[PDB]
Automatic annotation (TrEMBL), chains A, B, C:
Mg(2+) binds at D94. InterPro entries: dUTPase, dUTPase-like, dUTPase-like_sf, dUTPase_trimeric. Keywords: Hydrolase, Metal-binding, Nucleotide metabolism. The lineage of its organism: Viruses, Duplodnaviria, Heunggongvirae, Uroviricota, Caudoviricetes. The keyword Hydrolase applies. The keyword ATP-binding does not apply. This is dUTP diphosphatase. It comes from Staphylococcus phage 80alpha. One of its GO terms (biological process) is dUTP catabolic process. DUMP 2 binds at S64, G88, Q136. It comes from the Viruses. GO terms for molecular function: dUTP diphosphatase activity; magnesium ion binding.
Length: 169, 169, 169
């Protein structure tokens, strides 16, 4: 109770850190330096393993700062209780490939990185540095009941079969 | 307690299944065969209805395998307690429409499906087969209090009004 | 217990509202009128502040109606306990910029808005009106333990290091 086991898989790995006392998640550091071109997909290694206890799920999800400023989209990962593998960040550079070329790379602050050597990149390309906080881990309790098949449900709800914007907008 | 009612709506429907003993969600099978072109949006029918009890929400969310390998993006659906309608998978083929043509269709393993007959498809088109696990359902408890309007909050937090990457990166 | 403090920041702000008795979230109204061109990113102000108590997280997430009908993509925001700032909707118009022009704007019902004056817009542009329900807030309890670094985990799980579609599809 009130203790989570964390296993670092390499020297490139870093221990997750909570920002404030009442904050929800633990900021996840990147273990590798990755360059992502427009519309490219990848799984960023963190070299961090956790042992979520039974009755809980981990949500490997994006940070508001990175997601709002950059075209980097992270799909929220559902970390199962007992997953002792490498926590991978399911990421996509969602910037459009307009077939235009630039001489700069973007950082996770959406700013152009200063380089001494001349290089030609695609417009919308991002670079993630090793040891940068690009994601966070929020752990929530879960309900895992036994499924019971029925002909119809025992009670009629006020909601019914209404959905997908059945109310106003 | 510890029992969830599930109602199958057709012969094309399949009962949700949990992968491991300590796993979080129940894998959701597709009830229909759908072909999705680049940048096309659809709501995939599962023909499965559930009865989430009061004080819980269902999260109809993507699987890591499908989402990381394919351009198929699923928006996490919040299933209300008492929604007895058809569970629809809010999906988009997020592949770019580069106006290029191919003779193959992709499966949910991102592999080109072998076909005897010659057909011309758009580059980035996917095909979802009936009875395939493309999504999962994770059920979490919720807090639904009565809202109280105030002039200002009763306590000052260490966080304050800071957000959107107020700390480092 | 069973009470959430809400602070309205302007006259343009509106109090969040729950749709049904057993519904999960509170519908969030937009405080500003915003026009979003293809592939444009923005943070929509709600002028609403909340005081989430310790041990809970708020999920500022999209509604199924808007997300399924429109190209408007909202990233689920994790609202920390004690965040008294303006709740911003992290949004992107994910419609492709095909360099085509139209004389109509889309509403959040994906319908073309009737206008008396002639204007030229980009194809895929959306308009969000002030006082429209574009998002919702679902509050879930969290587990925030102290992190303990270990050489290896105390128990071997049936899952192990398997992930990213290790089972079938
Ligand atoms: O992906 C989804 C999302 C929701 N749903 C169902 C479950 C939920 O009870 C219902 C409506 O969900 P939301 O309240 O989150 N969206 P919205 O507010 O637009 O619909 P409504 O106006 O009917 O509440 O639709 C799905 O079947 N699939
Ligand atoms: O969509 C959002 C997401 C977050 N927020 C607020 C709530 C939260 O308390 C705060 C920061 O959220 P995160 O910690 O998840 N993102 P980040 O770590 O980048 O910001 P910070 O560095 O300030 O913690 O911003 C919004 O208003 N809208
Ligand atoms: O972003 C992610 C998502 C999942 N994972 C891990 C944790 C989880 O226990 C495992 C599989 O998660 P899912 O069950 O949600 N996806 P899928 O059903 O496709 O994989 P599998 O078939 O192995 O269960 O992969 C990550 O490391 N990063
Ligand atoms: Mg943070
Ligand atoms: Mg799974
Ligand atoms: Mg709703
Ligand atoms: Ni999500
Ligand atoms: Ni896109």
């Amino acid at each position: 109770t009130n203790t989570l086991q964390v296993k670092l898989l390499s020297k490139n790995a870093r221990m997750p850190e909570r920002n404030h006392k009442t904050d929800a998640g633990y900021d996840i550091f990147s273990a590798e330096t990755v360059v992502l071109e427009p519309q490219e997909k990848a799984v960023i290694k963190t070299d961090v393993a956790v042992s979520i206890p039974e009755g809980y799920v981990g949500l490997l999800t994006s940070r508001s700062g990175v997601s709002s400023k950059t075209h980097l989209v992270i799909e929220t990962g559902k970390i199962d209780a007992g997953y002792h593998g490498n926590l991978g960040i399911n990421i996509k550079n969602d910037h459009e490939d307009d077939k235009m070329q630039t001489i700069f790379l973007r950082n996770i602050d959406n700013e152009k990185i200063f380089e001494k050597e001349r290089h030609l990149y695609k417009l919308g390309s991002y670079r993630i540095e090793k040891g940068e906080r690009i994601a966070q881990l929020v752990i929530v309790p879960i309900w895992t009941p036994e499924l019971k098949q029925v002909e119809e449900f025992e009670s009629v709800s006020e909601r019914g079969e209404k959905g997908f914007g059945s109310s106003g907008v």
